[PDB]
Subunit: 161 residues, 12 copies
């Protein structure tokens, strides 16, 4: 017991209310993106349907794993996520996805915009998150990298060169 | 030969009522999946881990269920709406509460909400079956799986 | 606005006593079939031993998965299964499997008869089950299909020309 | 105690009408698989790869389906005929054309071929269900799987 | 050179006493598996899920074990009897009770049932080892595996 | 310095009409074999049913993979396969598979004869194929090897002493 | 060779003695945590035994992978780890784990405390590690994230709400 | 304080020459069995060819794994195996496998006799092996168990009523 | 015995011409793999995803191809040179352009460069086969695989 | 029936001597695993990679071994102590040195320490076997596996 | 739509030309390392050939995944990679790999130097990359960690202690 | 239409000379596998582990190869002889020596044994190819695989 601490209770790192709020912002936009991605996945029609149909599911998988990561990171830091439908709809920054069947061209533009909005949220909170807890900023970097890759993989369809 | 002579052969298309009935199932499955994740993250207390894990299995089932229904709608020339505003405004599920919740409360809450989801499917079943028995089979898989989830979750709170 | 239900307690579907009894009938024949299938698997000897030995294990696997399906369906619908040895022996409708070694030809006939008996139980309760709960009848269809396939794969050894 | 005392208990035998109804399904599933491969090899043009790949998935499903139907026939002591001459002579599917075909044309042709196959299953469905509901469930799986493939393929040509 | 010149060399034959000793092990392993499933389905209450899951692991082990014993019997030209009537008539395990049972009760009941099964193996061990040490090693695997399951189950009720 | 070619358009190897026709001959016999293999797989009954039932499926798998190989080799070399039912029936060299159930012994002989016929087609076109394109002849060697192995595994049931 | 360096020997990045010492601190606490985790895994008894038994093994797996990561990172940077039992016991900051069987409730509190002590060590050295080598700080972030998740998954058992 | 041993050189368990010779006896019969098993696998023809063909390969797999186990156990205990063809032929106790094709019925009897012979060697050396090294006798028990299972699975083809 | 009496037995060694011929194949396979990755990253436009993915499959094939050839050289006592300066100075492939490129242009470009690579292999084939038929078989696998890639890629740009 | 009538049936419990003997094995397995990792990280020199890798395999074996023994103790109502202070104070293994060590030195060191570990198991074997043969089988697996590791490691330093 | 943005087009984060140039530097050295690694993998001979042969392939796998990561990160950020042979040869900082067979000892020294040159490039651009986009710096940290591990695993062969 | 009307079509029969040529390949592949194992067990010294491991990979390849050849014989109605006495009596490989051997010696010995095996395949190649080119392709796989193993093994002793 030469260097052994003798405390009965050793408490964990707790997130500030600001930090909790910042992760909550990321969470709702990740959930909204997952819901919009599925909507697009189902309703996309037209030239190169299959590629887009498939890529949109990969986007959804990533955004879902991301939302679970953020929410559980909140839990680890003694914060409380709210991923309920009403909260997501009321607080998401993503422009609304339109109803009905949409062409592959339209879906490419729509989804690129919504991914970019999501990435913007993460980029906006990044410095405040990093200042308080660099380990959480690393989770943000994974999200930024993965989502920006998805945006490139989707938007390239509409590029005329 | 017995070969048909039509250059174009069309598929079975669902009635508006049929599409509307699948839409009802869809929003309740999506809502259940969102509430399941909420519960999964925020459950605390005795037997946390079991409930945390089971809730993820519920969510997995509800998500594949929503996809199954939405794609069945698409196959039948109906158009699903799984957007957050639509889900929130049209789900029949009792609202799941915010904040940390005890294991016992989560068991009771989620059981009610699974039962609400099964009720929607059972309510639309006969109208769906009458128009398209193949879709009713998909409904049966959902009823079976969700009722299995209800049993696996609720049993925690059962006394003798 | 909101279609949300307001009850704090929504109950699940509860099977009638008759429905419970009907699934219990299926359950005991499936367990008995599993036990007889293993008996035959160990004790078969003669021409084409290996094929029958192997096929019998596939039958046992299917019947075991089936009994779990039925028993858990009972539990889901607030019915209580009884798969105990005494109950199975006292209430199964299958003819007893004979003792000791049996020839491949005899095992083929014996097991085919026992599958047919098991399927007959499922067919007998089907309409009453389907009328109360269509979703459970679908599980019965899976059992009927899978077992009648086993009966074909086993019986065909003895079918001539 | 409750043990039946007969030494031979017969299984369920399909009527010859039932056998013939499943035979109708079988030949169209086989024809669909062969046309599917023809399309898979010979498709050219804009979005070749997706179509090439999706067509193989259709063929996998149709081949599993023909196995399922033929084996169900055998289970009920009917006897399938999936020989080339029989399939050509009795399939209801319009002939697939020869030579290379554009992706747009293949989309339309294959959608029609899938729809014709589903139509056969839908046509025999009630007669099959009346004699054996367990077989009708297999038909439901086929209907669902095939109509999903029709949606996944035809969507390429959909303009909105 | 060192080649034996007899055309038929007989294998090791188990005595009928040895066969009977393995038969004792077999019926208790089968009874344990059936009681294990009964428990797995009918357990309710605090920590349901863990017990539900652990009980299935016990059943998997007991089923693999009964296969091992019955196949060892056959290898040595003994003939197993795992029929329901025989198992019910000759098992040494106390009967599992009917109906839903609390997790606490199931823990105690199943621990007792496992211990009874191990006791049978321990009782025949020396007689089995004396005739065939290779079979005794299979008994050792069973003892180790079953006592591990007893520990994993009973620990739930242990108060310290 | 640089060995780089300067053409903007380098064409691929194009098969002669004769070469295309030779691979077409192989293709139709492989498809016909696959169809007959399944027929036999469903309709075989009698002593050692299961082994033959299972082996026939392995044959069908090999023949199906083979037909895809040949058809795609045709496509690679700018030839156009025809695997349609009417063409296969009208142009296959295999004797017709008989209708209805057949005994294990008969299926063994029937299918062995049909494999032998399929291999004979491949052997007949081999030299002409090898002379134009050695790489395609190698694919033929794979087919010859794999099918003659199937013929051994199936025929040996009927071989005595 | 337009931008090619012409040095025969190009040396790697070497950790300072302070950096080596900082990683050594993390290493001993990760090893101590793995040893305490196993002790808890074996000796935990009581209500919800299985969940805790299983979670404790997941903790041990993570802490073991973590110690290997830290030690090998030391090796890469020309530092030398010491993970020997005497060194771990003499230099760990973790409060000693008690002997004998312990209740699930006690184990939850004990292990949460020990995880939190381990995380505290990583958090304490983080800034010095990051200042010298940001790539190693990223390995620390993985550890912080994974361990804090484990603490949440374990401690939640004892939460009364 | 410390129970640590102080020797810099601690030697391992070394087998007696007799022990080495006993394992060598097991080794050559296992290799011979593997070689004969393959011979039978290639050369069997007749009723139920496929089942025997397949089962013989499982026998060969088991016997090959067995020979490696024994040979490596020898190496561990400072004994030196000899698995060379000349040694195996000159010292195996198994009757020679006959040349050319053999019927399924004959292969069943022939291979069953050869397994019985292999097991008899293991049974003959068992007590002497167990007395010197119980851990090696356990490996023998695995061989006895696995081979006698193979003998059952193969011989049962020829067992009547 | 028929045992050979040589203490040392040497392996087949390739002629300088043979090694030179495999070297020619090697640099063109490496160049193709590097151009394939360039195209994979920089392709944009209609059907981007299909082409992006197919190009990775081409690269995978060319990389395993280069390894196969280089190691065959090693087996035969020849010494490969796959260094960047050597590849750049000695490849016969038309240079792949820098910057973003449309799907249609990438199809045409890569098809030409695959065909150039196949041409090298076909050009050395007879000299390789004459010296060592076993190596010609490796060449056949490369010809087959690359020509399959050419077909899968070029079909995108094919019109009716 | 042959059913036993006891409501409670107890399991086999180990003597204090037996628990003490397994404890002796446990600390030496844990010590070996810790020394194995030390060696794995700090080995340098000729054939580094082989030794680095083999040492991880040794560690894997010793860790699963320690778990096996500790859980066997638990099954038998004994209480393991695998804490660092206990391991350090009670292990019989010669101390592994600090700092980088050559491959040849690591081979010699680890071989000695494996042999020390095997010696503990062999020293307790007969007392363990006499009380509970099933546990002796677990000991045999450890002796076999560790002695295999000793051979695979030491062979590096063997001269002709 | 309470927090919903109402922009039709939301643009992504775009890398500066300096940032694009910095990632390009990393890319060419990763590709050069992969090409040199394979050259070494093929041509290494002598004492401990196999270990080095195998480790060199692991190095190549990592460097290849790394180059794909960097290039695609460039694409995501609207930069354009150039991984062509001429560009790699003209702009790599790695000392040239020698021609012909090389001893294992020489290869160890050569490859360690080339890995270290590659790591130096990443370390040199790190701060500028991190200042502009911390998410990309995290990708750099993965590369630094993985490559420095490879250098340790390779160089340790030549260490005399 | 194009259907052949004969009821029995014979397959390709190997001549007895062809059978004998494959038999030569078979015995050397078997001898190589047995010598490979001998080496694998008995190799000691510097870089033991790599050699131990590579020798097992050689044996796996040689065993798959002997199966391939024996099965090709059977496919063409030849009859293999892989019995120990036949292999010892007719193999062309120099005898592997008894006892422990250094890694350096094993490298040289095994390289020679591989080269002798390849030589047999190369010797029969043209006679085999003339009668059946499909079999010659299997010989090519063996040549390529074995010469790869020779390179991977001998490189250990190569000084440059
Ligand atoms: Cl795709
Ligand atoms: Cl089989
Ligand atoms: Cl769990
Ligand atoms: Cl290795
Ligand atoms: Fe229905
Ligand atoms: Fe269904
Ligand atoms: Fe149904
Ligand atoms: Fe060839
Ligand atoms: Fe940072
Ligand atoms: Fe990271
Ligand atoms: Fe960072
Ligand atoms: Fe033992
Ligand atoms: Fe050739
Ligand atoms: Fe080939
Ligand atoms: Fe023993
Ligand atoms: Fe054992
Ligand atoms: Fe989907
Ligand atoms: Fe279950
Ligand atoms: Fe294909
Ligand atoms: Fe081995
Ligand atoms: Fe390689
Ligand atoms: Fe454990
Ligand atoms: Mg596409
Ligand atoms: Mg058979
Ligand atoms: Mg629990
Ligand atoms: Mg080595």
């Amino acid at each position: 017991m030469s260097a052994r601490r003798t405390e009965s209770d050793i408490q964990g790192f707790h997130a500030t209310p600001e930090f909790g709020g910042n992760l909550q912002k990321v969470l709702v936009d990740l959930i909204e993106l997952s819901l919009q991605g599925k909507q697009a996945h189902w309703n996309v029609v037209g030239s190169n349907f299959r590629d887009l149909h498939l890529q949109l599911d990969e986007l959804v998988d990533f955004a879902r794993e991301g939302s679970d990561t953020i929410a559980e990171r909140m839990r680890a830091l003694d914060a409380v996520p709210d991923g309920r439908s009403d909260t997501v709809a009321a607080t998401t920054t993503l422009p609304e996805f339109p109803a009905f069947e949409r062409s592959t061209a339209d879906v490419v533009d729509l989804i690129t915009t919504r991914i970019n909005a999501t990435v913007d949220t993460i980029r906006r909170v990044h410095d405040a998150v990093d200042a308080e807890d660099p380990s959480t900023a690393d989770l943000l970097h994974g999200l930024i990298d993965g989502l920006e890759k998805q945006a490139w993989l989707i938007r390239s369809e509409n590029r005329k060169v």
